[PDB]
């Protein structure tokens, strides 16, 4: 088999049928506008026939065309077109299935010929099939066949007669004689090449033998419409498309079998049926009291007609078919007549309502064919089916009643108003008003359906015989009466799959309907269906459905879940994941299948089934032999938990631990929200003038630290952003920004990430930091019995992590969540907490990113560089061991206090520390290569600190950054005072990445001087070799025949600017100026030490001398090696060509630099590095990545 064949062919069938409908309607004179307006052509009565001016329509059929025009005017062109195309597709598929199985009376193949391709078996036996379906004019058909002209007309008439006979058999799928579709029948179907030919030669006959394939192609017929509808609010006309789904056989079997078998075992268990079906779970026993209660409430016995099945969402009808199978088994147990059993199942206990008309038609066809397979005589009997679709009712009942002449045959002088007959009529009429978009969510009482059954039998008698116009009125009125009766009657079992909506997919009218008629679970539609099914479910009934898993565990629906557990009990659970269920293709949706008992029955123990682990193909035999019974859990156990989520891994010890335990709900609060100026109101910490923000705290004119919440951090870190709040956030107030909890601003406490991706973790939140939305904060109460340290220690416990995972399965958290997690008190937890926070603070201040920067640990120790590296690694591992000991002690003491063992994964065994190698790296490549990467990174950080200290921000003799002002103002005074007395700083502020040691202040020479000064004169050679080896290990590719100084110079030229950019997250402060491919000119300038005259200064002091040197060098090399023919001659010629190119590039860069230099532009730090980088021009390096925009040239 191949469902892909029909999956591809069905949308194409839809397209071709739509094209045929449109072309036939145009040939009928009916046209559509580009605005959707309907155009009607008038056929003048020239003679016996009529004509719209181009097409001579038959006059006798003209009133039918006018009726079709009226239908179009009532509905619309496009809706009528899709209706006709869908109906014709269904009819063609039905006839194809009919002929393939040979159920037809004539026993021939209509759509094709079994032996001859592109031919019809009906053409072989025209006399026989004609005498079979159209007994009149058989001789005429035979002689016309032998007349020798086209017989495709005869084939069309034979098809029409067969369709009429089928309609006489079942009317829902086939139309009566003299219908509108007959005049609209495509002319292509009357041709040698036809859509029927394509569908009979394309789809394999061996694949056609399965009715599941028929349901599959029914679902595939609406695929592109589903593609188009998604992404916007689904229109009411498009709502039935959104209600199109498919379900796997095994889940449907499980639901229906569990419900009917629970009823059966309740009645009497000795019946051998429980051996017959597959998916059923035996209920267990807990106490004799509940068993006695259920034995009291259970019935002694039932009858097959007593049990009834409701299908609020009929769809294709798989659920109803499985119900048919189990009901047939029950009837066989009764021992009734073999051929009467299917008839009895058809007559009753089927019902089933649908939103779309043709879905109901196909479901009825499937039921009729299943009965036909059971018994071949059922087709002749022609028993009406209860599967109908909810049709909109907007007609005047008075006119129909006058046409019905009902007023005088059984009872103008309308007196049935006193008999409530008119009253029930207009009540039902009003109930269904604009109900097509509403669906099956209309509630009706049972007295109404009793009276409606009486009136329905009356209408049946009237339609059987009487006045023809009364017959028409009864036919018009009957669907409303029958649908009202079906929707108002109560049912024993309601098993169906609710439609799957989108967030705001439903119409605004549906939004209002849900808002007014359901105060609970109004955010969705599946809960709507299940609640209404509970309304339609009688006492002690079973409601089995496959809903989403969101409402099993969510902060919303807490009232819904509480009410349903207080008033109902659920017998069986089945929690499927993203792949176990086959209802939706893809992991986006995650569904759960449940069956709930109507009676509350107080507390009862359910059985549970886990399926998230694997997929459907595995989950079938996994469910056959489950391993997740979890019978120990009880209803009272489930209700005793915060928010009442259904927990599969619930421990009574755990839930008992939760109770009688304090849980904060006031100390934690929410932050402030900016109204959309975050790009301008929040910035990175080192971009602003550090002299104004970190220092000069009295002014407060600069920004303030902010918390947002990033990577999971346990104790300290994750704070590198600032926000402007001058004059109590005057700019934010002018921006109309929401400021909540203003009283806790710049206050000491703790902060936890609002929406994390790994788990729950809160870190100490220092005093004086502004607090923002995201990374929400907690604030201990004044004179509170619990210190903040103790609360942090309690929350860091893995028990709290497991509890958080349980209460909110989603990794996202909220204020309501932190209102719920428990907290305890101890007199040693806070000491471990403060030790841990101090350790984490040291670790986070170990690097340059934090403003509490501690000096490089390598230069702090004297000796060999390898000695310093070993000491640094010793410090790292000592920190790690102390941290893990403290964490284990905390977990052990909290476990001892709890008394119930708890287990977590990657919560306690994992710690957050940069010293820990596996945390900062992938952890999957533990081959000791990560140790080498650590070595290379450490050496690179040392080199970066050296180049920073060379250039004026850091002074090795002092502590921390020594210059942080803007505009190169206030630097000479520091020099005179003695800040840089040990190591001088380049006065011009320009670091040239020039050739090998040509300029006075080449970076390589300065770094060599630095490494010499730090570690003496005797070990400098081996230290330089060690640094070069570390660089060549992992940061840069190893090179052959390279000296240490060459290695460090090559690292500085390439893969140093990239590393510096990565370190500061695309916000560089050592800006780079480059010339291009030749790299003739390369310089580095400090952002905070940039002056407007620096451009011209460096243009006149670093470019023209280099240009002169290049010119002298090329002249000398041109003179050198004259008339030489050795290899060195070619080498020198290539070198001189290369530096000729470099000279040309340098000259162009000089021209551009002089053109930009006269402007003497100046930038402001508060603007941000992005806008300044864009403003500088094309002389800057790598602006596309930094500013996310292409460079410009002037």
């Amino acid at each position: 088999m191949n469902t892909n064949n029909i999956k591809k062919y069905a949308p194409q069938a839809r397209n071709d049928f739509r094209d045929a409908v449109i072309q036939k309607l145009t040939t009928l004179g009916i046209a559509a506008d580009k605005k959707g307006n309907l155009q009607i052509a008038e056929a003048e009565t020239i003679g016996e026939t009529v004509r719209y001016g181009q097409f001579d329509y038959p006059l006798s059929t003209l009133p039918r065309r006018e009726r079709l025009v009226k239908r179009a005017r009532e509905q619309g062109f496009e809706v009528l077109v899709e209706h006709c195309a869908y109906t014709w597709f269904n009819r063609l598929c039905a006839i194809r299935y009919m002929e393939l199985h040979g159920y037809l009376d004539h026993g021939f193949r209509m759509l094709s010929h079994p032996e001859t391709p592109t031919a019809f078996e009906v053409l072989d036996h025209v006399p026989e099939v004609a005498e079979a379906l159209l007994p009149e004019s058989k001789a005429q058909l035979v002689e016309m066949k032998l007349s020798g002209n086209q017989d495709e007309a005869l084939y069309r008439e034979l098809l029409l007669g067969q369709c009429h006979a089928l309609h006489h058999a079942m009317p829902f799928l086939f139309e009566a004689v003299d219908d509108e579709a007959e005049l609209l029948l495509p002319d292509n179907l009357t041709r040698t090449d036809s859509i029927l030919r394509g569908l009979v030669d394309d789809i394999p006959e061996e694949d056609w033998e399965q009715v599941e394939v028929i349901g599959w192609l029914y679902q595939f017929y609406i695929s592109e419409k589903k593609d188009a509808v998604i992404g916007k609010v689904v229109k009411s006309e498009d709502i039935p498309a959104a209600t199109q789904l498919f379900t796997p056989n095994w889940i449907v079997q499980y639901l229906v079998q569990n419900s009917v078998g629970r009823q059966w075992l309740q009645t009497y268990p000795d019946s051998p049926l429980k051996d017959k079906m597959e998916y059923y779970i035996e209920p267990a026993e807990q106490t004799p009291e509940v068993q006695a209660q259920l034995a009291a409430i259970t019935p002694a016995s039932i009858e097959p007609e007593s049990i009834k099945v409701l299908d609020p969402a009929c769809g294709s009808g798989h659920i109803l078919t499985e119900a048919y199978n189990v009901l047939k088994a029950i009837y066989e147990e009764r021992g009734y007549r073999t051929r009467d059993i299917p008839q009895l199942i058809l007559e009753n206990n089927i019902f089933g309502l649908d939103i779309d008309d043709r879905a109901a038609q196909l479901s009825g066809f499937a039921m009729l064919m299943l009965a036909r397979q059971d018994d071949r005589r059922i087709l002749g009997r022609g028993v009406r089916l209860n599967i109908v679709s909810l049709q909109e009712s907007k007609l005047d009942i008075a006119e129909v009643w006058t046409k019905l002449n009902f007023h005088q045959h059984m009872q103008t002088a309308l007196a049935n108003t006193d008999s409530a007959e008119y009253k029930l009529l207009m009540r039902t009429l009003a109930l269904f008003t604009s109900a097509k978009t509403l669906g099956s969510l209309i509630q009706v009482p049972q007295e109404d359906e009793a009276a409606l059954k009486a009136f329905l039998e009356g209408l049946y008698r009237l339609a059987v015989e009487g006045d023809i116009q009364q017959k028409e009125a009864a036919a018009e009125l009957i669907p409303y009466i029958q649908q009202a009766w079906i929707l108002a009657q109560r049912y024993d079992a309601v098993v169906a799959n609710p439609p799957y909506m989108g967030g705001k997919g439903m119409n605004g009218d549906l939004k209002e309907f849900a808002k007014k008629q359901f105060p609970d679970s109004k955010s969705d539609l599946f809960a709507m269906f299940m609640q209404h099914a509970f309304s339609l479910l009688k006492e002690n009934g079973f409601n089995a459905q496959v809903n989403m898993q969101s409402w099993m565990f969510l902060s919303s629906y807490e009232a819904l879940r509480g009410w349903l557990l207080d008033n109902k009990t659920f017998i069986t659970m089945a929690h499927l994941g993203a792949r176990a269920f086959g209802q939706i293709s893809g992991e986006v949706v995650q569904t759960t299948a449940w069956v709930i008992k109507n009676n509350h029955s107080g507390f009862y123990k359910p059985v549970f089934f886990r399926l998230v682990d694997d997929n459907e193909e595995h989950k079938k035999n996994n469910l056959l032999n489950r391993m997740n019974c979890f019978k120990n859990t009880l209803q009272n156990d489930f209700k005793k938990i915060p928010g009442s989520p259904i927990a599969y891994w619930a421990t009574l010890a755990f839930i008992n631990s939760f109770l009688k335990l304090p849980a904060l709900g006031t100390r934690a609060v929410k932050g402030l929200d900016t109204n959309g100026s975050i790009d301008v109101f929040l910035r990175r910490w080192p971009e602003v003038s550090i002299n104004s923000f970190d220092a000069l705290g009295k002014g407060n004119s600069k920004w303030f630290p902010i918390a947002k919440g990033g990577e999971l951090r346990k104790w300290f870190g994750n704070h590198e952003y600032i926000i402007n709040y001058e004059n109590d956030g005057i700019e934010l107030r002018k921006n109309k920004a929401n400021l909540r909890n203003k009283d806790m601003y710049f206050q000491e406490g703790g902060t936890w990430t609002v929406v994390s991706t790994t788990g729950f973790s809160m870190r100490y939140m220092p005093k004086g930091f502004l607090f923002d939305q995201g990374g929400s904060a907690v604030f201990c109460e004044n004179n509170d019995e619990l210190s903040i340290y103790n609360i942090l220690a309690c929350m860091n416990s893995k028990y709290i992590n497991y509890s958080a995972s349980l209460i909110c399965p989603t990794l996202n958290f909220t204020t309501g969540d932190v209102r719920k997690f428990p907290v305890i008190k101890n007199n040693h937890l806070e000491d471990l907490a403060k030790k841990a926070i101090e350790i984490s603070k040291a670790d986070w201040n170990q690097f340059e990113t934090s403003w509490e920067f501690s000096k490089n640990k390598l230069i702090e120790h004297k000796g060999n560089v390898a000695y310093s590296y070993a000491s640094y690694c010793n410090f790292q591992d000592k920190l790690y061991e102390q941290l893990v000991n403290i964490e284990k002690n905390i977990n052990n003491i909290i476990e001892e206090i709890l008394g119930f063992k708890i287990e977590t994964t990657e919560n306690s065994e994992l710690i957050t520390l940069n010293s820990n190698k596996i945390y900062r790296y992938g952890q999957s490549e533990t081959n000791d290569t990560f140790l080498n990467r650590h070595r290379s990174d450490t050496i690179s950080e040392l080199i970066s600190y050296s180049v920073g200290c060379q250039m004026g921000r850091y002074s090795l003799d002092r502590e921390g950054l020594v210059y942080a002002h803007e505009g190169n103002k206030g630097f000479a005074d520091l020099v005179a005072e003695g800040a840089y007395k040990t190591f001088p700083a380049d006065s011009d502020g320009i670091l040239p990445l020039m050739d090998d040691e040509w300029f006075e202040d080449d970076v390589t020479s300065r770094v060599k001087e630095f490494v010499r000064t730090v570690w003496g004169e005797e070990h400098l050679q081996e230290n330089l070799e060690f640094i070069a080896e570390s660089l060549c290990l992992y940061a840069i590719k190893p090179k052959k025949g390279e000296s240490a100084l060459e290695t460090i110079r090559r690292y500085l030229s390439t893969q140093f600017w990239k590393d510096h950019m990565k370190m500061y997250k695309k916000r560089p402060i050592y800006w780079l100026f480059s010339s291009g491919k030749e790299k003739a000119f390369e310089c580095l300038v400090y952002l905070h030490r940039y002056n407007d005259a620096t451009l011209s200064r460096m243009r006149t002091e670093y470019v023209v001398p280099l240009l002169a040197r290049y010119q002298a060098n090329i002249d000398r090399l041109n003179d050198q090696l004259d008339e030489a023919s050795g290899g060195e001659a070619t080498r020198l010629k290539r070198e001189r060509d290369s530096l000729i190119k470099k000279f040309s590039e340098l000259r162009s860069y000089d021209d551009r630099l002089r053109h930009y230099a006269d402007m003497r532009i100046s930038i402001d730090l508060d603007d941000g590095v992005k806008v300044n980088y864009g403003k500088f021009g094309d002389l800057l390096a790598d602006v596309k990545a930094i500013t996310g925009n292409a460079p410009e040239v002037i």
């Binding site: 967030g503 705001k504 955010s523 969101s550 902060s555």
Partner: protein
């Protein structure tokens, strides 16, 4: 070699960044996330030479270059490889960005919480 990753891991990381940024930046239309997709593609490209070669040799990305503008004008080759990876990442990420922002539309639909 010392590195063994495919384009799939880099794409997953970039997709995670895109989700994080559509959450922080509060973008509700389909035109104010071009910066978001740009940064998501930019912060995903590997930096180590062996890593870039490994992802270059893996499936999911194409050796040919779609646009000339993305090509940097340098004598370095690993720069060009990073540019190619960046282009592939941004193309696929912008392809999935519509669905991601549509998902965030559910959250922005309500005024207190998506699920309320």
């Amino acid at each position: 070699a010392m590195s063994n990753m495919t384009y799939n891991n880099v794409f997953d990381h970039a997709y995670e960044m895109l989700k994080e940024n559509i959450r922080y930046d509060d973008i509700r239309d389909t035109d104010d996330l071009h910066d978001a997709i740009h940064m998501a593609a930019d912060n995903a490209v590997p930096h180590y030479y062996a890593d870039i070669f490994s992802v270059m040799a893996s499936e999911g990305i194409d050796l040919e270059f779609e646009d000339s503008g993305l090509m940097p004008d340098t004598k370095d080759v690993i720069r060009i490889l990073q540019a190619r990876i960046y282009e592939q990442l941004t193309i696929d990420l912008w392809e999935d960005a519509e669905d991601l922002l549509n998902e965030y539309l559910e959250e922005v639909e309500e005024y207190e919480e998506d699920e309320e």
